[PDB]
Structure formats: structure tokens, C-alpha cells
């Protein structure tokens, strides 16, 4: 894990998303995803 950022929680609400391609996990404007097309971001999901 990354160290503590003192101004991350409020900047996450009051600033624009800096992550490239945000809201890709929602899949609101895209096609429905099967198991092969799903997102597995973390090592626990990748492992299982």
C-alpha cells in the first residue's frame, strides 16, 4: 500500500478524476461483460 496522503479523501470528491479511463468498472455505456471480458483489478480476484 501507498503511504498516507493528507489531502486525498477530499480531493477525490472536489477534484476531477486523475485515473486514466475512470468509471470503466461501472460499464454503464458499454456492452455487458462475460467472465472473459470482466475486470479483475486486484491480485485476489486474479488469483481466484
Amino acid at each position: 500500500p501507498l503511504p498516507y496522503k493528507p489531502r486525498a479523501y477530499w480531493d477525490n470528491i472536489y477534484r476531477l478524476p486523475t485515473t486514466p479511463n475512470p468509471f470503466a468498472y461501472l460499464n454503464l455505456f458499454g456492452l455487458p461483460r462475460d467472465e472473459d471480458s470482466e475486470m479483475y483489478p486486484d491480485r485476489m480476484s486474479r488469483l481466484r
Partner: protein, 393 residues
């Protein structure tokens, strides 16, 4: 599965003699997501900047060099009506069921599409009203006379009103013609704001209900158009030097908020988020998607540019419409429940008639009965069932 759509409007003669692009089409309606396509078309319109308005029944298009508004029914997919206004149209916005028009003479005309009632304010602007923004309680008109006027919607819309309409406040810190106006979606006394861009390379954030200039920003070139992000965190501004800038309200050096500096201090912005090539041209119109991540700009050379703010600094060309793209208006991917539907429009008229409202009443289930519980219940409701059995026996 949400599909995002947008309506584009072009003006002027075609730039190149291409037989593929139809000459008569002035309004297009596209689907941005998931695949770009031309969903529908509307013919015979030359619409300047800020003279397009879109609602779920109708498309309003002010005509270039004429005092005309073409109304197109999207439900029927055809041009419903021609509307002739007393004065030339420089700008128009649609708010609810009233169309607000800022003219060349300096007048503001509000036309109710359901009642056919026209209210024409006196010419408090000595020059043409360049831009108009509207919130459900206020109308802000910025004109070429370096003046921004705030009008009350309820005061403008009164039955049997004979007093000449006067704006509540005048916001005139600018020293040049006002190019653009945008408002926050808020309506509170202290939390709302408006950003106004003028030809003096300046954007001013005001609290228009208190008449206080919250912030002053200076750009290398005079701004053409802006848009807030949907979460009100940032301002996207196109400029004359073909550059697109982003200004964040709540950054490390915040323009607004508790950590912000004095309002008299003027913030210089010189770092461009993006730029377009000189063969593309400066962004004539700008719009932000429903998510807020995508950004569509229309340029006078006919191409539409999509800007992925998180992903790509450079824009991506969607299509070339062979004529100067003047307006881009997004449509919400969700459907909104409205108790009345404006199926047909009413032309503006000046006659002594009783106030009539013309709309189709939607089924909103305002009336509820106890038998509706039995009807909509899957199976029979319990207490009603023992009541029926006991009254049977």
C-alpha cells in the same frame, strides 16, 4: 445499456464541394456511445453560435440573418413550425417550456411554447445580447455593451403585468464584449456562481444573487466558449489561439473555497490542456458529456473533436460535416418523468385571450385507491383476502 446522444447544428455554405455531405441538412443528431453514427437529420437550417436548444420533444434553431426560429418535432422527426420573432436572434436558451431569446436590439423575449405568450423586456442593453444562461429562478444576459444583467424568472412571468421589466443587478467588471456565460446548477443564496468570459481575455466568477465577483482569471487569448464539468469542479474554456484550458476550482491553489486567496487577486492561467492545429481552427462550441470525462468541440472547419480528459491530451476527430459546426448539445441517457408532454407547439401571438395551457397530461398515478393494491399485488393481498372470505361467509 446507456446510449449517449448529441445534437449538432451547422451554419454557412459548405466549405468543399462534396456530394456525399448533403447540402440541405443543417441539424444532425448523433450517438456518441458506443459507436459514432448519424442517427437522424433535419434540413433547411443555418444556426449561428448559441442559437440551438434541445428538449425531448423539440429542437429550436435560430436562423442566421433572419428573425426566425425553426422548430423541429423529434417525435414526428420533421420540421413542425416556423416562428417569426419581432427582432433578430443573437442567442437563445430553453428552460422548461419557455424559450429565452437575447436579441440584436438588446431586448430579451421569453416565449412560452405551451401557452403562446411572449414577454418582451425593454432594451436595457444598448448593444446585442451575446449570451444568455438560465436557472429555474434567474435569467442572466451578457451583452456586447460589457454588461451582464440578472432577471427574476417569476418577475418576468406574471399574468396581467404592465410594469416595464427591470433587472435585479448589473455585473459590469468586464471591459469588453461578453463572449460566454455559464452557471452552476445550484440555486442557493451563497453557493451558486456564474462564469462569464469576455473579449478582454478574462473570465469572472460571480455570485450573481449577491452581485459579488468571486474570482478573476486571465487567459493568453480571449475566450470563445466554456462549460462547467457536471460535478462543478472545473471549467473548460476554448480560446482564440486554438487552445483548450482547464481551470480547477479546488486544487492545491484553489480558485474558490476556504483556502482560496483574496477575490481582488487575479489568477493568470497560461498552461494549456490541449491545442488544435491551425487547419482545424479554434473550438467554436464546447460541451461536456454526462459522465464528464468526454468533451466534444465543434470547429469552423467542420470536424468534431472528442477530448478524453483523463486519457488523451490530443483530440480525436469523429467526422467532418463540411460546414462550420456551430452548436453541440448533449442529451441525457436517462429518461425523465414529466407530468405533461408538449406534443405540439403554439405560435407566439398578441391578442386578448384567456390564459390557456396546451399540453398532454401524462399518466403519473397521482390518484391511488385501495383496489389498486389488489390489482398491482402479485396474488391477492392478505388482509383484503380475509376480508373477502369473512364477507363471503
Amino acid at each position: 445499456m446507456l446510449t449517449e446522444e448529441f445534437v449538432s447544428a451547422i451554419c454557412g455554405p459548405p466549405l468543399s464541394s462534396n456530394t456525399a455531405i448533403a447540402k440541405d441538412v443543417g441539424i444532425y443528431c448523433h450517438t456518441l456511445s458506443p459507436s459514432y453514427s448519424v442517427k437522424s437529420t433535419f434540413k433547411k437550417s443555418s444556426v449561428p453560435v448559441n442559437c440551438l436548444a434541445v428538449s425531448d420533444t423539440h429542437i429550436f434553431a435560430g436562423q442566421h440573418e433572419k428573425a426566425y426560429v425553426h422548430v423541429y418535432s423529434r417525435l414526428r422527426g420533421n420540421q413542425e413550425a416556423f416562428v417569426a420573432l419581432p427582432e433578430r436572434i443573437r442567442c437563445l436558451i430553453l428552460i422548461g417550456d419557455i424559450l429565452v431569446v437575447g436579441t440584436t436590439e438588446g431586448r430579451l423575449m421569453l416565449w412560452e411554447i405551451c401557452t403562446g405568450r411572449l414577454v418582451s423586456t425593454p432594451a436595457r442593453h444598448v448593444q446585442a445580447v451575446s449570451c444568455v444562461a438560465a436557472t429555474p429562478s434567474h435569467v442572466l444576459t451578457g451583452s456586447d455593451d460589457s454588461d451582464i444583467h440578472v432577471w427574476s424568472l417569476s418577475q418576468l412571468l406574471e399574468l396581467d403585468s404592465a410594469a416595464e421589466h427591470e433587472p435585479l443587478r448589473t455585473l459590469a467588471n468586464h471591459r469588453a464584449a461578453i463572449t460566454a456565460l455559464a452557471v452552476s446548477p445550484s440555486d442557493s443564496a451563497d453557493t451558486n456562481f456564474c462564469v462569464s468570459a469576455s473579449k478582454d481575455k478574462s473570465c469572472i466568477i460571480w455570485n450573481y444573487q449577491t452581485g459579488d465577483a468571486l474570482r478573476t482569471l486571465i487567459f493568453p487569448g480571449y475566450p470563445l466558449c466554456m462549460s462547467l464539468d457536471p460535478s462543478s469542479r472545473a471549467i473548460f474554456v476554448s480560446c482564440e489561439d486554438s487552445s483548450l484550458y482547464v481551470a480547477e476550482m479546488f486544487g492545491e491553489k484553489p480558485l474558490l473555497g476556504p483556502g482560496s486567496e483574496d477575490p481582488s487577486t487575479v489568477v493568470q492561467i497560461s498552461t494549456p490542456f490541449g491545442a488544435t492545429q491551425p487547419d482545424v481552427g479554434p473550438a467554436s462550441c464546447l460541451s461536456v458529456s454526462y459522465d464528464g470525462t468526454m468533451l466534444l468541440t465543434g470547429h469552423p472547419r467542420g470536424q468534431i473533436m472528442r477530448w478524453d480528459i483523463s486519457e488523451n491530451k490530443s483530440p480525436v476527430e469523429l467526422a467532418n460535416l463540411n460546414a462550420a459546426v456551430t452548436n453541440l448539445i448533449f442529451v441525457s441517457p436517462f429518461l425523465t418523468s414529466k407530468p405533461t408532454k408538449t406534443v405540439n407547439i403554439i405560435k407566439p401571438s398578441q391578442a386578448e385571450r384567456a390564459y390557456t395551457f396546451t399540453a398532454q397530461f401524462e399518466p403519473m398515478s397521482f390518484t391511488k385507491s385501495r383496489l389498486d393494491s389488489l390489482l398491482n399485488a402479485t396474488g391477492f393481498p392478505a388482509d383484503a383476502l380475509e376480508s373477502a372470505i369473512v364477507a363471503f361467509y
